[PDB]
Each structure stands twice: as structure tokens, then as C-alpha cells.
Amino acid sequence: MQRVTITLDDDLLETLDSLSQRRYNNRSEAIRDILRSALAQEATQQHGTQGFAVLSYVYEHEKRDLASRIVSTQHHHHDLSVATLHVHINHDDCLEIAVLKGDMGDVQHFADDVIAQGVRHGHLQCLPKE
Amino acid sequence: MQRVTITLDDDLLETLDSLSQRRGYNNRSEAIRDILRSALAQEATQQHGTQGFAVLSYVYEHDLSVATLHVHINHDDCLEIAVLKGDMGDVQHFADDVIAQRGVRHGHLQCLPKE
Amino acid sequence: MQRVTITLDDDLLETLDSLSQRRGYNNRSEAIRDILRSALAQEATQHGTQGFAVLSYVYEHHDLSVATLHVHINHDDCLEIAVLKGDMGDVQHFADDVIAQRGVRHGHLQCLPKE
């Protein structure tokens, strides 16, 4: 265990202390619990296992730059793709849902590129073969 | 913004760093800040007034519905992805009622309330 | 280049002229000449041949399915769009099977053989 120092916006810290009354004791324990529950679903998929995955995110299809960026890595790694669903959620935003399949290690590596590239609300739900 | 000191065990810091490698987080701080903010939106309850969209996905052997995608993930299991639109409160209640029914596994709900 | 003289009904020609406007067909000849060439293609790509197909229909263990999309077009009716893959032969059969079923209306199968 190590003692770390993080810097959080005044807003988040306020939203946090708020939740700290519906559930804590002190920020440390509040932050610890949330962080732990959130990471539980973020384990590293190991190269070797097969399965599927649901990658969802939002982006403005109003920007040709991001649009071409998200569209390029998609086609270039079409091997993982099973089908992608698109839905305009407002005049500028497109909600994209991509069903991926293959090596879970590759699926997660691929999804993480997207989630980090104008992409917002990106979520990856890994579904390892069972 | 403030600076806060917290103690995290070696098992967790490992996932956090493991996760930071993947998403390209510069520092633990931006990581935790993103994970925190993001986690506070998924757990909080959607007030039965604000509108938006949501993605409901789950595996198994109507007004809030924009479209649902079904895919066979083996001979027995079916992955179903429902894009939902409406009262974020109705959306979530309907989701939660689905995610706990009979043989519904890996249920997940991602809410996208209006900007 | 040969000349073929065909007697065609007035009503039919009205629809062809309408289609020509929407497409830019300079004259009937270019129009017929094009519809024809496209139909004969759908006819050469009829078993043994692999590809994709789009099966859609409104509705109140062998699976050539890649994914199916469902959209509620009203309280009572649902639009189903299945993307099929595999042998165009088995694909056409699966499709006929689906279309005969009770309830199913407006069935259409669009084949897309390996091109």
C-alpha cells in the first residue's frame, strides 16, 4: 500500500462529499470504495481468451477530423467487428454501439484506443467466453 | 480544485496503473479524477424528470425503445443491445427490472442524459 | 448492338419514365438497358455461392445470422432486419421459411453474393 495525493476539482469533491452521506465516514474511504468497485470491471483481458464485447461511445459526426479518425481505426481493424449500430442522439452527437468479437486481449486493446481518442462516454463491456 | 491524500492497497494500485496504461492516463490524478466522475454518473439514480438516451446490454438463452440489436454469441446464448430513449427515470427503472429478471446475465446500463 | 422493339403498357412506361427522372437516365433505352443488366446479375448469383443477405419484414437451429435489428414501428407492429451470411442457397431457403410464417408481412430478401 502507498499513500498518494490526488488533485480533484472543487465540483467533484462536492459531489463526492454529498454521496458521502447516503453511504461513509471520510473521503478516503469514500474514494477507496468507489475506485475499487469501478476497477473491478476493468481487469486486463489476457491475450489467449476468446469472447465478445460491447463498445459504446458518443462523438460529434459534425467534426470530419474525429469522424475520419474513428472511422479509420474501425475499418483498419475490421477483424474484431461483428456489427456496429449508429444513432444520432441530438443534432451534433452520434451514439455508436460496436459489437466486437475475437481475442479479448485484442478487443480490449482496440476499444481502449477509441475510448481515449473527441470520443466521450466511452464504455467497454467485455464478455469472455465462459 | 483541491489536493487530497489517500491510502490505497497494492492490489488496487496495480489495477489502477494497469488501467492507466490502457487509457493513456498521464497521472494517477487524472485517472482517479476520470474514474471518479465517471463512476458517480453510473451509480447515481436518474431523476424521473430529466430526458436522454441509454444503452442496455445483457445476455440470455416499448416506448423507451429506439432500437435493439440481437447477436448470437454461441448456440445457446444471445447478446441483446437495446438503445433506449425517454425519461431517464423510466429508462433506468425499466432497465433495472430487466437486469434482474429470470436468466438475464451480464446486464449493464449506460445512461446518456441530455447535455 | 441490336434493336429490340417491345410493346409495353402505358402504366408501366409511366413508372419507368418516373424512375428515369430520379436516376438521370437520358432516355428509356438507357433506362431499360440498365434495369435489365442489373436483374440478370441478381439471376446469375442464385447454391454453392457464398455472401451476405438482408432480410427485413414487419411482424406483429440452423442460423446463418450475423445480427438482427428490431424497431417498433408502432404499438402493435415491429420491424425486423436480419443480416444473413453463408450459402445463398441456404440463405434463400431460411428466408422463404421466415416469410411464409403467420404474422410476417412485407418480407423482402436482398442477396449480396461475394463480389
Place this chain on the structure above:
Amino acid sequence: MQRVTITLDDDLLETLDSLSQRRGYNNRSEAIRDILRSALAQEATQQHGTQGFAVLSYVYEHDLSVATLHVHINHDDCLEIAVLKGDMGDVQHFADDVIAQRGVRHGHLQCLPKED
């Protein structure tokens, strides 16, 4: 009825005559008329002022959109299926516009006007 004359290349007529043996077309006219009648049944002009849905699909390498599905049918081509809702005239107009774009092959529009 009108007597229409059209010029067809020898290749197509060869393919046409062959197809005619399998289908029972007793001459080029019957062949042409029937292929033509069946193809125009799916191409009536949609009128503005009427509502409904539509499925637009094609291959590639007013918010009429409800949802679009994309599938990779090979390493280069993409099958795209768009569920459209709105004025049928605009839907069709839009589809013809998509179908006219270079790069778009196998375009097909299935119109589902409001039922009852």
C-alpha cells in the same frame, strides 16, 4: 400501349437469351417485358405528404434516420442498413441521392408506408 425501341449490346442479349431458356420466355420481348415489370413493381414514386418507415441498404468501400447498422462484408466493403422514418417522398429522394453517390453499390430501398 406503346411500341418501344431500345438498343441492347450483343453480350447482354446473349445473357438474356440464355436466361430465357431457364424461365420459359418464348422471345426477347416477353423476357424484357417480364424482367422490366417485376423490377418496376419495387420502384413506384413515393409522394410527399404521406408517412411511413423504410429500410435503405447499400454497399460502400430533416432527420429521417432512426438507426443505422454497419457490417463489414469483407476487408474493403461495408454493408450499411438504415432504418428511415418520415415523408416517403423525402425518404425516397434521400435514398436516390445515396444510391447516386459514386462508391455506392447494390442500393435497395424498401418502403413501408403507414399501415391501416
